[PDB]
């Protein structure tokens, strides 16, 4: 009856907060005589050291679900990749509190991965919904030659093909480049006037600097950039009038930890009440057998519903990603981020604040412009 729940948070403070949340869930709602146990380990600097420490300190402790977060350190990785891969040899589910990378969305790579935050795919979905509600039919899609950029491009193309719509062209971008002026000139030599860009912070800063000298910040150049492009040097070099996106409660790790603990407890209760549970391996060395109840626990977690969380309705997609998240449509006004609209899911409700556009124009621009230079 004794259960243990592992976790990997950012050192002592978040570990203590996770333990407090575990105790609260033990003393609230479903409260049995022997509910579960709380274990945690800090993110080690070396990925190999982190992987071996997770192995030794969690599999030997009979963990059923392990919570892992991704601290956004720019210089270092500190990614959940080693922990996810170590848990992938078995079928122990993991929860990503703030894993914003789109790599984990594919289950071919990460066999058993879950998270409570839509990495970038639902961000592209919000882009599509905003372009639909604002009547945008001319999109210049700038996509980096990386896995997350390709995934975002594929999702946007699939969403556009739903209504039999297709962008004029999708410019490719290589990370770390500095000669993107040719790509920007190609974008300028197009009928479309709105640009959707998805890149890292340094790439966003570089393309902003390149486009500043090409008169790409004038009237009619609508920008629908994402979250990574309105922070750091990207925010510093971001042209005025950017309609950026910011995820509500996506940075507050404590709320995600509490939601993950609640969902894990509910899934454990459902699994125990459903059928028998196979005991987790005593150690992570010696036994190569795959967990038989691993896929069942994954299905229970994915189908689990948590309406008492801080984000209201909490549910998982077929890829183990948060569905119907709260996105805030941010706007840049006088080099300051001004929140305008909130994305509650399949609905966009702008507030009374007026959305400004690049070039200082007050009226809403349009992507429909006739070149009148038909070659």
């Amino acid at each position, epitope marked *: 009856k004794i259960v243990n729940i592992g976790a990997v948070l*950012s050192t002592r403070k978040h570990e203590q907060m996770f333990r407090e949340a575990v105790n609260q869930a033990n003393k609230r709602h479903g409260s049995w005589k022997i509910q579960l146990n709380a274990t945690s380990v800090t993110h080690k600097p070396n990925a190999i050291q982190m992987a071996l420490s997770v192995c030794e300190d969690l599999i030997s402790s009979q963990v059923y679900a392990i919570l892992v977060s991704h601290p956004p*350190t*720019p210089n270092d990785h500190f990614t959940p990749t080693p922990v996810s891969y170590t848990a992938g040899f078995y079928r122990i589910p993991v929860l990503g509190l703030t894993t914003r990378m789109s790599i984990y969305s594919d289950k071919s790579i990460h066999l058993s991965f879950l998270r409570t935050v839509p990495p970038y795919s639902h961000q592209s979905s919000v882009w599509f919904e905003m372009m639909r509600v604002y009547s945008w039919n001319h999109i210049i899609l700038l996509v980096s030659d990386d896995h997350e950029g390709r995934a975002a491009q594929k999702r946007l193309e699939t969403l556009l093909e739903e209504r039999e719509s297709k962008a004029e062209k999708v410019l490719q971008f290589d990370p770390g480049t500095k000669n993107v002026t040719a790509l920007l000139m190609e974008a300028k030599e197009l009928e479309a006037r709105v640009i959707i860009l998805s890149a890292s912070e340094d790439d966003a800063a570089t393309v902003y600097r390149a486009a500043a000298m090409l008169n790409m910040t004038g009237s009619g150049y609508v920008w629908l950039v994402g979250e990574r492009e309105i*922070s750091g040097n990207a925010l510093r070099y971001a042209p005025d009038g950017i309609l950026g996106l910011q995820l509500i409660n996506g*940075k507050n790790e404590s709320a995600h930890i509490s939601d993950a603990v609640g969902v894990v407890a509910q899934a454990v209760h459902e699994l125990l009440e459903k059928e028998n549970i196979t005991d987790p391996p005593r150690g992570c060395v010696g036994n190569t057998n795959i967990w038989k109840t691993g896929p069942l626990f994954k299905r229970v977690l994915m189908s689990s519903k948590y309406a008492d969380g801080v984000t209201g309705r909490v549910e998982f997609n077929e890829d183990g990603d948060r569905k119907f998240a709260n996105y805030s449509i941010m706007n840049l006004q006088n080099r300051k981020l001004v929140q305008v609209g909130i994305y509650n899911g399949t609905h966009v409700i702008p507030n009374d604040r007026k959305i400004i556009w690049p070039g200082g124009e007050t009226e809403k621009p349009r992507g429909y412009q006739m070149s009148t230079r038909l070659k």
Partner: antibody
Amino acid sequence: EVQLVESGGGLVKPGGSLRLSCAASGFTLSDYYMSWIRQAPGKGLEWISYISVSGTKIYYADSVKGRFTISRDNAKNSLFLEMNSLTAEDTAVYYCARDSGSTMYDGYNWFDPWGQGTLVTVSP
Amino acid sequence: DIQMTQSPSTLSASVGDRVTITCRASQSISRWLAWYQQKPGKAPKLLISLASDLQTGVPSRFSGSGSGTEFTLTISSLQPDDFATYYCQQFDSYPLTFGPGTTVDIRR
């Protein structure tokens, strides 16, 4: 300009009360977390209090727990710290600084920017 | 609590030389550490975040390194405006504590 100004310091007899006002300029106070840190002369720096954006999560240092009170006025963009039961060891230079848990992840502070600071002296 | 020890307490170096400051924590704090520069009579200013990331508006000569229990701050070229007191502060767990501090002096 993003600058902070400390005001309200002075000489207070032991056992009295004093209030410190931190002025926020160049940015909105409701968008960042604030914290008070004092620097005893001839000693290191010691973080004292922490106030969250929502105004409901308040944490005090164990050394001065139960004696200090921290309040914020988002509309006024000013920070107010209340000190009680001042002692000789409380004589330190108090600085109010801006945290970074909003833009960055939780727990990331690296307090910046720092105001010019004020000197609080306790002597009978 | 977390105890940070800085050795040496004081050091002297000439202009243009490389200065190494060692910060050692009692426990393991991964990479959660920050560096401040404090002038006499002036409030400290942040230099390095996450023990390796250079802050905006700070000269590139400042660069940190190390992780876990030992940390190192390195200045590529010492300058007259770099002579101050440096504190390594960790934000691993509450309460947030600052190191004793290291002051850069002039070797004559």
